[PDB]
Design a protein around this nucleic acid. Structure first.
Lengths: 335, 108, 228, 335
DNA sequence: TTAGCTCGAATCGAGCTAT
DNA sequence: ATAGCTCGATTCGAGCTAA
């Protein structure tokens, strides 16, 4: 009857590293190899009562008493130097290949059927649309999450590191290439073919991606935020902790991977939001909602079950979504 | 009262340790409470810390233990708004002033 | 001696013994299906009751952790202020109209989740009564978290009959419901021998697989699913 | 049914940088590019008991014995060089735009209604009065909190930066523009138009803000104050530490932002105090009280709920206050 | 209450039909 | 959707043992 496998673990393609933040001045970014790193430091914040009150704390005496005892805490803060207006963020990306092959599979017949399904996809249309959209999210600085919202000029440089050396160099204007449209461009097409060769398994590709953002002198930059155990004293609370590896502000690799993953424009709801990350049940953390609900028969699992088990191939857009979710990887199958 | 009695007992059983454990190196060693934690350091330190402990008479240790008890009580706003927190603070003030009077005459 | 079966659990002894002190001993290991839970070295002079009492505490803490892990999510009926809870209902699933909500004064009654980011909608007492009637959770709904989703589905084309081990979650005296097999057969209007044929071990020639309607009516009558 | 969302986080507009202090001589402001930075310095203080006693410490013997052992403290102090009477304080400000769009939300219907409300406001009354008041708080050195309270002359310069170069420069006398009146001036009108273009999303607005205050030779300046974990002894208590980034006395960015938000002249209480910082429940730390109590229905939350849900548009001043609260950002939205 | 087992009888699924 | 069939496999009840 060819039921689905209980264990369907997949390994991820498109492996990014931690993205390190350094700082410097515009028009000296061609010699940015020795730019000083952005350092996460401590500052003190004093806050008032600015949250909603539950109809019992709205008493004027209680509210004023809460004012007389403000919350004192220290926060991890990352800022550019006062003589530097450009933020440099550098990471390396490795594209593996072999997306349709699971890392663990209970059923051999289901494994073979899934391999035939993915091979039929690649033979019909290869990793060309998906790689083009991944190259688009590389060209624009979407991995530069909050450091791009107010940057005046953003430039992304992507190199192909073959034997430890730049075999091919790309330079992009990350603001001309927006965060909404997946258009066509010759350099975007070349990077798309490179990522396609990586995803198909034709050759080994390693991409060094460097983004420069002209934000301003001494302006705040935004690395990834860590978890606080919340055990110390209230005055030295450490309400905000920033991610660094060796005294250098950094962005988590999975955040970079999530920003590169933002290629899903095929979800049933409208195009007002634009692309979203290719996740099962189309989850967006900021909106707190799930596009591609399982009730709407457009999530990853129902589409994969219809495509593989019972040969109901969906539309080519949903096929792109399914293959991008297999590239994304995850612990599929019933636990 | 039982918590403050157990605190006094715990200091009394730390009194049987080495006389100069408070002088060991360290970034965090609770120097504010080390005057009360090790009375016996005044014997070896005739002029370094004996006169400081005699003249200062540290009673802010009671305040720190009261802050610890405030951290150890349930964060109920209903009690804080009503007079229940007033009675609790009054009985806490009585127990802490008794505890501070206990720590006052430690130099005898 | 021989293996002790307590619902889904099994206390099997080691084949070879040992001597601790001057007395003979065997290692008794506790299982939950294929999951080994604990091993104890016990004297050979213990009876089955003492061996069972040695693992009763581990079984009890497993039961407590299973009740707290798979407890049904709770909906709360609040007033316009959103502070005072007027009624609490535990539901097997949430209403499909739940969105991010803070109660207003435009509506007197609001139904909200007990989860910290609260989801809700304005509700009347008639609508709240209807939702509580058609969404409530049975008192032993936590046992469904210990069962796979392919035995608890109402879709007959996606349904699989439960195995003997999955039956013993709810049918035995050492099970999570605490009813006997004869009581379970009386609930289904079935002979006790025919129902024992359902929970027969693998070392048996007469084994029967329970049907869709019988299994789901058993779950209804046991207070595990579809009982509100 | 349009209920308000449980998360309504907003990102801040008008992002200020950390304001660095350097010192020098008046009439050298045009050559103040390489002024020496004001350095936080360590000094030892000894004082007598001056706090109020609780009627049980008023024993003359105990008071005299306490005076026999006065408290010894070390504090951080910031002073000008002896050959320098002018304080230079420099920071940068980014004006972003897109105030009414939340960064995190639950309900899509609430988000759409709130965006429609903000668009209706911007169409009917654009970012003009708010920009005028922000430009006023930028042209009077209110961010020089205690550094202009007794200065002979305060002079602030505003520059507009596009390519690392000044696009247009503003020269202001911060004592002529008072801390009380939001008047009209042509240079102030041009700066307000620039702030309006920034807040409307029309273009990029980056401003560096340099303020010169003639205080006196070797006088004390007042940077931002940090917190002390108090893990030391009772002789070197370190009872006061000051904020600095790299051996240079600095003011916290949130303090500059609080000084820039002081535009709220519409609170129900009498405005003889003057403008206050825009914030929910109008809670000023100096007086320890809350203008715009929720009981008088003039706080941010009740006005926003009535404007969006019930479509009860408040007075134009109150909706100016609400949009200013959207500009400052926040974590609005309880459970 | 657990844990099974025959033995004939009734039921069950999946093939076909007919109307 | 109604209405009904055959045929081999599975279930079912009421005896029974076994503990």
């Amino acid at each position: 009857i060819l039921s689905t496998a209980s264990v369907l673990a997949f390994e991820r393609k498109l492996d990014p590293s931690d993205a390190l933040m350094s700082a410097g001045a515009w028009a000296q970014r061609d010699a940015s190899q020795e730019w000083p790193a952005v350092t996460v430091r401590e500052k003190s914040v004093r806050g008032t009562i600015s949250n909603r009150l539950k109809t019992k704390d709205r008493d004027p005496a209680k509210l004023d008493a809460s004012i007389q005892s403000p919350n004192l805490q220290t926060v991890d803060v990352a800022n550019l130097p006062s003589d530097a207006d450009t933020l440099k963020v550098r990471f390396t990306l490795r594209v593996l290949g072999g997306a349709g092959t699971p890392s663990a599979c209970n059923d051999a017949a289901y494994r073979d059927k899934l391999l035939q399904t993915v091979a039929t996809y690649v033979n019909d249309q290869g990793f060309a649309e998906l790689a083009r959209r991944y190259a688009h999210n590389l060209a624009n600085a979407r991995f530069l999450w909050r450091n791009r919202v107010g940057a005046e000029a953003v430039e992304v440089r992507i190199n192909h590191i073959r034997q430890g050396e730049v075999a091919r160099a790309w330079r992009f204007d990350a603001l001309a290439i927006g965060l909404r449209d997946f258009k066509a461009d010759a350099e975007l097409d070349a990077l798309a073919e490179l990522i396609a060769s990586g995803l198909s398994g034709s050759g080994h590709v390693l991409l060094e991606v460097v983004a420069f953002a002209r934000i301003g002198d001494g302006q705040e930059v935004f690395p990834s935020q860590e978890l606080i155990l919340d055990k110390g004293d209230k005055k030295g609370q450490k309400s905000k902790t920033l991610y660094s590896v060796r005294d250098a502000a950094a962005i988590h690799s999975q955040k970079i991977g999530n920003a590169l993953r933002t290629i899903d424009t095929w979800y049933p709801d409208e195009d007002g939001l634009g692309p979203i990350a290719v996740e099962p049940y189309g989850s967006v953390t900021s909106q707190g909602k799930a596009y591609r609900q399982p009730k709407q028969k457009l999530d990853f699992y129902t589409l994969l079950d219809n495509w593989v088990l019972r040969d109901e191939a969906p539309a080519v857009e949903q096929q792109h979504y399914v293959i991008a979710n297999l590239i994304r990887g995850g612990v599929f199958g019933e636990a | 009262a039982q918590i403050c009695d157990e605190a006094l007992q715990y200091a009394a059983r730390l009194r049987e340790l080495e006389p100069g454990w408070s002088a060991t190196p360290g970034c965090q060693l609770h120097d504010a409470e080390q005057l009360w934690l090790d009375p016996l350091r005044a014997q070896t330190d005739e002029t370094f810390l004996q006169r400081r402990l005699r003249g200062d008479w540290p009673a802010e240790v009671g305040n720190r233990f009261a802050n610890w008890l405030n951290r150890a009580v349930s964060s109920d706003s209903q009690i804080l708004g009503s007079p229940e927190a007033a009675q609790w603070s009054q009985e806490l003030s009585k127990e802490l002033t008794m505890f501070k009077e206990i720590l006052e005459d430690e130099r005898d | 001696m021989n293996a002790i079966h307590i619902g889904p659990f099994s206390i099997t002894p080691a084949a070879r013994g040992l001597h601790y002190g001057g007395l003979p001993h065997h290692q008794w290991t506790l299982y939950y299906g294929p999951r080994e839970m604990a091993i104890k070295t016990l004297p050979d002079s213990y009876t089955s009751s003492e061996v069972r009492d040695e693992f009763s505490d581990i079984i009890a803490e497993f039961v407590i952790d299973a009740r707290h892990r798979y407890a049904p999510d709770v909906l709360e009926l609040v007033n316009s202020d959103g502070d005072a809870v007027l009624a609490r209902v535990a539901v097997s699933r949430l209403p499909e109209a739940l969105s991010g909500c803070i109660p207003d004064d435009r509506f007197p009654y609001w139904l909200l989740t007990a989860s910290r980011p609260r989801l809700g909608l304005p509700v009347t007492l008639n609508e709240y009564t209807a939702l509580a009637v058609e969404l409530s959770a049975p008192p032993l709904a936590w046992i469904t978290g210990l069962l796979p989703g392919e035995v608890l589905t109402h879709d007959a084309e996606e349904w699989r009959p439960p195995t003997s081990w999955e039956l013993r979650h709810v049918v035995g005296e050492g099970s999570f419901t605490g009813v006997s097999g004869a009581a379970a057969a009386a609930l289904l209007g079935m002979s006790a021998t025919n129902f024992r044929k359902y929970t027969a071990g693998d070392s048996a020639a007469n084994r029967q697989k329970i049907s869709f309607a019988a299994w789901h009516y058993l779950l209804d009558r046991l207070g595990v699913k579809r009982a509100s």
